[PDB]
Structures are given as structure tokens and as C-alpha cells.
């Protein structure tokens, strides 16, 4: 079992996946307890009073979603609550908090009481990002770095004596890592660091690219935009391998390409791809939306024979890059070879949990589990 192994498999849960039609609906009881060692509930948010608060009272509270995910502690899974996420990280409110010691002191006592009220095992910090607010390093003050480090210390000082966990989801981008993170302090105090080794490329690049390359590719604009560089950089900055869990995407980045005639990497893009029926977000497709396009709508798949990155698929002017089972096995062997703490997925509700594509239920996540449990490297 994963729980008896030397590896973590940290699964993000998202409360908003409930609000999807038909088979895209995901509920707490859809969580497969054999596939995760840790479940992280996305998200709670930062209230205007500087205190953590529920993001969606109808699900989290009225329909007892918090309690129904904390249910999984009964299997020996550790269940944490994540604070933040992309939308909540817009603007200055996390910076205002961490630069104000009085506000941090108030926040910390309330946050631990909040976790204990609902039975969470710990807190996951997902501020995107200290200093580089929503990856704009011109926006935030340098002092976000020390402020975040002191927030992590102050949370640790209250959580650790109670046996509660503290983790963070962190940038894979060199520039953001350098500006936002006091890596030695975080590495010492956090129980794990979930490196978000995905979203390296997307519609914002104005050209096609892979959501989550593992190794450098000769046509890359930089040597930094791949999981191999990112994970080694976190270690170079002072993170122990055992503290790192490597993120893997259960989804793809989609693109509307400018001309249907060329369809390779780095080709011009006019917009995000057309939204999926279930996830309804331009530029984004769940794995179960992608595999259906390939299986039943004739999308053409291009693989990398050197396995530096997963596949992409295209049809007409639509183009999506994503991870398949093959590249996932390669990434998990990479995790094992570096003796990392384990793997992480974003997110439970985006894998093909319903077996819509006939590859079995949870094909990507089961591929991770099987390779993590395989002794050979
Ligand atoms: N009541 C119910 C409700 O509950 C429910 O509501 C739901 O709630 C949930 C939760 O809030 C919602 O989910 C969220 O949905 C959103 C989508 O709508 C998601 O948003 C996305 O999030 C992802 C991340 O998770 C974002 O991804 C990021 O995107 C940005 C860009 O947008 C990327 O940032 C860019 O990064 C690149 C590098 O990668 C960087 O480029 C560099 O810039 C530098 C500096 O400028 C350059 O350097 C210079 O270069 C030149 C030459 O090269 C030199 O001369 C210079 O010297 C040099 N300095 C360099 O070239 C580049 N390397 C860019 O600058 C940077 N901007 C970022 O990386 C990427 N991570 C994404 O954008 C978001 N859209 C969100 O994640 C979800 N959680 C849910 O949707 C919501 N509905 C409701 C549901 O129905 O129902 C109610 O009932
Ligand atoms: C994985 O990433 C690491 C580190 O970024 C690469 O190892 C480096 O190899 C390059 C060759 O230029 C050197 O810059 C460093 O001297 C190496 N560092 C270490 C610690 O070996 C490694 O090449 C990358 N792997 C692949 C397969 O691309």
C-alpha cells in the first residue's frame, strides 16, 4: 500500500468540481482512499478581516464537504486544508498580512482553531506567490520573502506541538523561487514542499508548448522551464530531497493555433483552446476531456520518442499538451531516482475517475501509485 511505502502521494481535492454537469460532477465520496497518502482540500481563502474563512459555505459547511473529506482520516490518510489558490492570490491581501506581525499573530491562532474545529490534520499554504503576485515580480515587495518565512515559522510553532502538519505548494519558476522563498527556512519547517512542476507553458506564451516537460528540449527558450531543472534547483537552494513532492498534472493546457497547417511545438497561438464541456475554462482541459477527444473525436497524438515531455494532441485549430501514462511512469521513476519525498497531483477530479476512456478508473493516478510501489528504478 502507499501508506506503508517510503513515498507520499499528495492528492489535491477541489470543492468547485462539484459544480459540473453529468459525469464531470465530483463529490467527496468519489475520493478513492487507495490512491493517496495525503489529501489537501482546495481551498479556504483569506477573509477581509485577515482570517482564514470558507470559500464556499454551501458546499464546505451546509453540505458538510469539509467533514466529508476529513472522513478519509479513517483510512490513515492525512487530510489538510489549503489556503489560497490562484484567484485568492490576486492583489495585495496576502502581502499585507505577512508584512504585519500583529496581523500574522492574530491569523495564526485563529487558523489553528479553524483546523481543529473541522478535524483537519494540517494547513497547506498556496499563496501564488510571495513577491511575484500572480507571477508578476514587479508587483510585490521584497519583504514578502521574510514575511512569508516568519508566517511559516509562526504557524509551525503552533501546529507542530499539536502534531499538526504544515506544507506549501510552491512555484517551479526560477525567478519566483529566487524572489519569494527563503528556501532554508521553508525546507527546515515544512513537512513537505509540493513543487507545482506544471503550467510551464500555456496560452499566455502566445505559442504552443508543453504544460509540464520533464527534461530540457533543444527548442526551449530557456534551460529552466522543465521539472528536472526545477527540482534540482529547489535542492540546490537548500531543500532536502525527502521534503519535496513533485507535482504532476491531471489536465492539459489547450491552445487555439493561428494556422491549422502547422501543429508542432512553439507555433503561434491566438488564444486559449475552446473550453471543455465539463471544466468550462478556456485554455484548460481535464485528462478525461482530452482522452475522449483522442479516442472518439480523432485528435492526432504526437509523442516525444526521447520522453523529455508528454504528448500533445490536435485537431483543426485546437491543440493541447498533457501527461499520459507513459510519461507519468517516467516522472515517477525520476522521483524515485532522486529519492524525493514522493509525488503530488493536481487534481483528483481531473483524472478519468469514471473510466470514460476505457483505460480503467483513474488511469493517471493508478499509474503513479503502481510505479511508486514498483521497487525497480
Ligand atoms: N459558488 C461556486 C463557486 O465555488 C465556483 O467558483 C470556482 O472557484 C475556483 C477557485 O477559485 C475557480 O478555479 C480557478 O479557475 C481559474 C480559471 O478561471 C484558474 O485560473 C488560472 O490559474 C493558473 C494557475 O493555477 C494560471 O496559470 C498561470 O498563468 C499566468 C499567466 O496568466 C502565468 O504567468 C506568466 O508566467 C510566464 C512564465 O511562465 C511569465 O513570462 C515571463 O515574464 C518575464 C518577465 O516579464 C519575462 O522575462 C523577460 O523576457 C524578456 C525577453 O524574454 C527580457 O528582455 C527581459 O529581460 C526579461 N525580464 C519572460 O520572457 C517570461 N519567462 C509571465 O510574465 C507571467 N505573467 C503563470 O506562470 C501560470 N501559472 C492561469 O493564468 C489562471 N487562468 C484557477 O487556477 C482555478 N483555481 C473556479 O474557476 C471557479 N469557477 C463556481 C464554479 O461554477 O460555481 C459557484 O456556484
Ligand atoms: C537534470 O538537471 C540537472 C541540473 O540542472 C542536470 O545536471 C547538470 O548537468 C549540467 C550539464 O550542463 C550541468 O550544468 C550541471 O553541471 C549538472 N549538475 C549536476 C548536479 O549534475 C542534468 O543534466 C539534467 N538532466 C537531463 C537529463 O537533462
From TrEMBL:
Limits of the GH18 domain: 7-375
Family: Belongs to the glycosyl hydrolase 18 family. Chitinase class II subfamily.
Cystine connections: 11-36, 132-137, 291-357
Lineage: Eukaryota, Metazoa, Ecdysozoa, Arthropoda, Hexapoda
Sites carrying sugar chains: 228
Protein name (record): Group II chitinase
Residues of the full protein shown: 1606 to 1992 of 2929
Amino acid at each position: 500500500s502507499l501508506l506503508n511505502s517510503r513515498y507520499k502521494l499528495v492528492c489535491y481535492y477541489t470543492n468547485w468540481s462539484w459544480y459540473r454537469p453529468g459525469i464531470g460532477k465530483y463529490s467527496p465520496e468519489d475520493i478513492d482512499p487507495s490512491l493517496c497518502t495525503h489529501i489537501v482540500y482546495g481551498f479556504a481563502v483569506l477573509g477581509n478581516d485577515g482570517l482564514m474563512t470558507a470559500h464556499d459555505t454551501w458546499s464546505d459547511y451546509d453540505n458538510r464537504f469539509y467533514e466529508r473529506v476529513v472522513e478519509y482520516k479513517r483510512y490513515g490518510i492525512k487530510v489538510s486544508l489549503a489556503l489560497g489558490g490562484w484567484n485568492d492570490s490576486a492583489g495585495d491581501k496576502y502581502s499585507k498580512l505577512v508584512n504585519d506581525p500583529a496581523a500574522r499573530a492574530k491569523f495564526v491562532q485563529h487558523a489553528v482553531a479553524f483546523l481543529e474545529k473541522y478535524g483537519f490534520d494540517g494547513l497547506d499554504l498556496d499563496w501564488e506567490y510571495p513577491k511575484c503576485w500572480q507571477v508578476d515580480c514587479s508587483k510585490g515587495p521584497d519583504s514578502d520573502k521574510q514575511g512569508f518565512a516568519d508566517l511559516v515559522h509562526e504557524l509551525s510553532a503552533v501546529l507542530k506541538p499539536k502534531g499538526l502538519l504544515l506544507s506549501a505548494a510552491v512555484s517551479p519558476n526560477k525567478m519566483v523561487i529566487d524572489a519569494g522563498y527563503d528556501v532554508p527556512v521553508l525546507a527546515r519547517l515544512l513537512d513537505w514542499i509540493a513543487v507545482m512542476t506544471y503550467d510551464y507553458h500555456g496560452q499566455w506564451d502566445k505559442k504552443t508548448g508543453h504544460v509540464a516537460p520533464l527534461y530540457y528540449h533543444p527548442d526551449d527558450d530557456t534551460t529552466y522551464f522543465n521539472a528536472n531543472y526545477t527540482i534540482h534547483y529547489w535542492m540546490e537552494k537548500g531543500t532536502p530531497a525527502s521534503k519535496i513532492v513533485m507535482g504532476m498534472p491531471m489536465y492539459g493546457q489547450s491552445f487555439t493555433i493561428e494556422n491549422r497547417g502547422i501543429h508542432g511545438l512553439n507555433i503561434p497561438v491566438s488564444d486559449g483552446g475552446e473550453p471543455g464541456e465539463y471544466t468550462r475554462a478556456k485554455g484548460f482541459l481535464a485528462y478525461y476531456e482530452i482522452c475522449d477527444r483522442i479516442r472518439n473525436s480523432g485528435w492526432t497524438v504526437v509523442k516525444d520518442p526521447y520522453q523529455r515531455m508528454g504528448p500533445y494532441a490536435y485537431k483543426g485549430n485546437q491543440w493541447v499538451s498533457f501527461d499520459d501514462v507513459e510519461i507519468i511512469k517516467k516522472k515517477v521513476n525520476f522521483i524515485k531516482s532522486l529519492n524525493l519525498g514522493g509525488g503530488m497531483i493536481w487534481a483528483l477530479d481531473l483524472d478519468d475517475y469514471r473510466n470514460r476512456c476505457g483505460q480503467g478508473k483513474h488511469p493517471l493516478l493508478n499509474a503513479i501509485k503502481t510505479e511508486l510501489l514498483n521497487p525497480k528504478i
